[PDB]
Symmetry: C5
Subunit: 322 residues, 5 copies
């Protein structure tokens, strides 16, 4: 009866796992998941499968036999969707030795969940993993382990992403508990992800800084030139609003406050202050003309105070986000 495991009713069957990674295929920051494609290999012994031959060598069989015999039942924990490839036929392999020792192999694609934190964006670093477990049988019936310890993961040479840098592949194990069903063995594959920071600098931090620097030119123009100092400020506000809106229309739509938001809105406030300043100056000059009938003090103080405050802001900000 191949509807029962080897040693059914006695001790547990040892089963050993080996993996080779083909590609990482895509990543979603909104949905917090990744997609991966791999080969997965299993090893065990089943004397019911032993056959009388002198060759001492394995024999390859088609995947038709897999529906007749007994076979493990691993599954991918915290997956959203997966499948086995089937063109031009099922991507399945079975090899059996005269002893009854079996090798069993599959090609599969999996989408898996990875919780991410974007509060340090674009200076964040993320770490994800893929988890493998037996569905039906508990550690009292099936023993699951990496077939060669640390050497049981292989990774392909041409793996890459158009938006990320990948590093630090390693494996580990853990024992897990369900309240209604029991204890199981679980295997893990781990890796790390990072970004290209200079791209984001050039695209986001650089224009805003130039705009704040442009708002400081106003302190050096003659206060008598009202039709020249009034349009400059409000046009500068317009430009900065355009820039911020542009950045908002292309972000990955996660709805909480991130490191880059703070920089942008602080720059906005600096430009806004620059526009209240000249109103101060104009009003005071005008009342002086009225009262009676050279650079203003607030101009020559602003020329020092504004840049120094911006420099202090930058020091603190990059002390916090490093």
């Amino acid at each position: 009866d191949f509807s029962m495991r080897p040693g059914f009713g006695g001790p547990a069957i040892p089963v050993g796992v080996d993996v080779q990674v083909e590609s990482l295929d895509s990543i979603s920051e909104v949905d917090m998941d990744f997609t991966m494609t791999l080969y997965l290999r299993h090893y065990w012994k089943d004397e019911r499968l032993s056959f009388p031959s002198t060759n001492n060598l394995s024999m390859t069989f088609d995947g038709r036999l897999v529906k007749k015999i007994w076979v493990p039942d691993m599954f991918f924990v915290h997956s959203k969707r997966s499948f086995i490839h089937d063109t031009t036929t099922d991507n399945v392999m079975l090899r059996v030795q005269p002893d009854g020792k079996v090798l069993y192999s599959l090609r599969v694609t999996v989408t898996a969940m990875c919780n991410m934190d974007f509060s340090r964006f674009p200076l964040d670093t993320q770490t994800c993993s893929l988890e493998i477990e037996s569905y039906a049988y508990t550690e009292d019936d099936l023993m699951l382990y990496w077939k060669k310890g640390n050497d049981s993961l292989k990774t392909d040479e041409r793996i890459s992403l158009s938006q990320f840098l990948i590093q630090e592949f390693h494996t580990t194990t853990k024992l897990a508990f369900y309240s209604s069903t029991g204890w199981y063995n679980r295997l893990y594959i781990n890796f790390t992800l990072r970004r290209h920071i200079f791209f984001f600098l050039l695209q986001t931090y650089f224009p805003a800084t130039l705009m704040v620097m442009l708002s400081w030119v106003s302190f050096w123009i003659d206060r008598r030139a009202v039709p020249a100092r009034v349009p400059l400020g409000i046009t500068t506000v317009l430009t900065m609003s355009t820039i911020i809106t542009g950045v908002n229309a292309s972000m990955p739509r996660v709805s909480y406050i991130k490191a880059v938001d703070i920089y942008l809105w602080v720059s906005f406030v600096f430009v806004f202050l620059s526009v209240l300043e000249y109103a101060a100056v104009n009003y005071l000059t005008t009342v002086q003309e009225r009262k009676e009938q050279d650079t203003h003090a607030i101009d020559k103080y602003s020329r020092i105070i504004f840049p120094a405050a911006y420099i202090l802001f930058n020091l603190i900000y990059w002390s916090i986000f490093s």
Copy 2:
């Protein structure tokens, strides 16, 4: 004949349900639905399945047997789409005791409907549920209940969404009626959803307020400076229109009026009034020059009246939406 239920033609079979939630996977505000992934477990007794063994312990069987025996037929009410996972094999488990007591378990993903009301956006709160029912058999043939009352729902530790905060998981029951078919028992899982309000404040309410404050600077500039007071107002109109359009291009495209729309358009009207004001002043000054051949009264009244009206608006608005 496993084409008939236990006790077929006599009283009803009691069946008990247990659930554990793996993840919430996505949410659509336009389509008004959510996606969830879970384990679902069933319990019943069927003496046709009893077997002679002394062990007093359950035996695990593969999912091949499920197509041979009789099994419940639960389904998800108000679902749009669902499926059972099948890699590397069907995610199905069957455990049977010498008595004929059965345990039956599945892993599934479901998309379900949840009517939402966005009229208090972004200050809304939504509540959704998942509903479970038997398709074919009525309460005269099958009795459906939670296996352990309030303790029959478990929820995973690492559940989260990139756009929402989740709280308040609990279960309940109700009896339901179809006019052409009869009465059935129904089980429910309920939960609540909320947003991050400070994000939306900073992104939407803050720029508009700054713009209205910028429009009030005009009352303090000398009415004699026409080429300075005329471009300021119309450029301010341009900036506010840009801001409103930016917000309109990223909203979730539900076509009725919401709490935030009102704020934005009232700010627009304030900026517009500021531009009619100086036209009043300019015209009256000009006719006075003509008639004959110091701050104007309408300027020094506007400096008080405009901010006070905006303050009244804010008081009422936040008394209504709280």
Copy 3:
């Protein structure tokens, strides 16, 4: 032989239909279709299915039997895609009476075609329908009718759409002809759709009107102030172009002219005329200065003529679209 209908070779079999609507799920204006989810029920008599029991009561059977017996073959006319739900098992029910009277029931989702006309957008009203027909058998073999006349449609209480208002559900029948195959009976479900008009007013008609009103302020400023009257007009053109582009980027991309387009472009022409007007005035004043070496007539006529023409435009436009 259940490969032949009841009364095969004699008169036609009467089959009666009953329907209950669960939800409308989505709508596409670009593709001109909608998606709906429903229960569908069939009734007929087949003496081959009669069984000797005294109970005078129906017996419920699983969906395994449906592949053995004979069953109708209805299909959805003018559908793009459909399917039957299958979790946790096929959503199929079979009930049979000792007489051989049968009841047969399904749960399904359908996407169906509905030709729409958007030329009165956003003041349009649309009407769609779902059509049911037998595929293989003609009115000489199968007779199809609503089981209870007008009472054979039920609709759920919690149906709604985030973009539309639904009204006027009713059913009817018609006889249809194919040239190569024959005559068939067809059943219909009809309903109507409408929009929220105030949303569209506030978002589209209101800003444009305010802009046209802003362009009329120019007639009251002193013609001597050239650097004040020249930038006002061209900035107003810029603002109106921004607004029109914003509306164009969010419409449902159907490529013919609609009711709202006309309003927007007529407003554009009014703003454009306002800018040619002052050029007239400036040139004539300048040649008068040259010739020789108070409000201009064209100013004080424009102050009357422009608003009156806009009022006439609005009267005609809302007489046409009502």
Copy 4:
């Protein structure tokens, strides 16, 4: 053995085709394909299917028999994807006469490839076709023809697209060759497509023309008014750039130069020239003041030259694209 065709090893079997079109469903300009839904009908004679009855009339059978008998094997040449509808059961019909004459019918949806050329956009016209061929058997085994010549295509009354106008349905035939396999018979359905040109005119050509006309107003303003003639030109450049960007953000993303691109960029150059012109005038006036210590010649020539060149441009352009 229904694993062999009628007359297997002798001459070829004649098979006749009939088609009725239900809808065209969608079109992709980026991917260069369309989607269509139709009924497809086949006719042939097979004496193995003959049965002893006096009725002289056809008998309708369910689609279960189709997997037992022999049946043609047509397929859709240059398709990307297709399928047969299956709700509430397979959309298949089989009718057989006592003679062994058979009729066989299917309902299907197909996506097919159509190479398009957009270089005359939006003044282009496209022509597409659907191709039908036998997969396995060559013209030495199977003869394929339209069952009634030109009368073998029917088209539904309510066919339409939200973006296109459809005309000119007709059928034809051709003989085709594969180098490794042989000669086959092929059938074709052809049709033509066109656009709504006034929509595109109003949305694209009209604003740009108005902007060029606005740039010519500058030649009539007094050269002494520098703060009035300088901002006008650069604001006009800004407006035209906004318009061009708006059009670029909604086009179907095919990356080569089209008829409308040329118009837009030529208008851009005209506006740019207008801004160099006044610089000429200002500089020359200023050096004259310096040298010494009425309308300028370049103004009164520009007033003639610019519009005439634009008129020449339009004549040539519409002589080329008609």
Copy 5:
């Protein structure tokens, strides 16, 4: 036993491959893959299939037999997804000779991975390939080769893409190694891709250049005209920011720095310098007036220095990217 290959336990079976390409269907630059549709053909000899006939000619069989006999098991290396077409029936062909020589043919669509480098965008050139391999059997059991050397690839006449130009189709072979399973033979199809460069020039490089040229007009306007020289520069900054944002909103979202980015941001810096320049001039003139109570030197130097630097920039840039 057709569960074993020809010559099972002896030497390896030679199998020969032939291919014809129907279309390339789509390309993703973000995901770095392409989609292709083809016919694939196999040749081998199996004496178990030999039959006694004098004809010396092949016999065509339906695809029902393929599930009974033994057949190769090729698969597509570095594919993301694939499938075999099945309407109106499986696109499969089997031809067998009295000898036992077999021909076997399929129609399929494949999506395959191709690593791309965009750092020279839009002046890049990409090269991709499709790889074919046997899944289960190693070079000790199956020998895989092109059936006619270089002549075993055919390509269709009407292949094209709306965004790319295709050239240089050829085939090759390589021997490959897996650490846990052995050595295999692999076949390759290679091709090259290129863009339309003039489109990208006109859309991106041309406007920016015109804007830089517009910023140089300021050096020729009279330094006394402050309300004319101040708004020109800041409006020019606004226009250039709009242009850059427009380009950023339509690029294929790969997050590293490319050839075109550099040009755009260098143009931005040139426009920014032009605005600091006049501030220099204004301040120095003003202090001279104060000190005491003709073209400035910095103006007449800028008129030479700015264009020469831009010309040097262009020379170096196009020496690097050619």
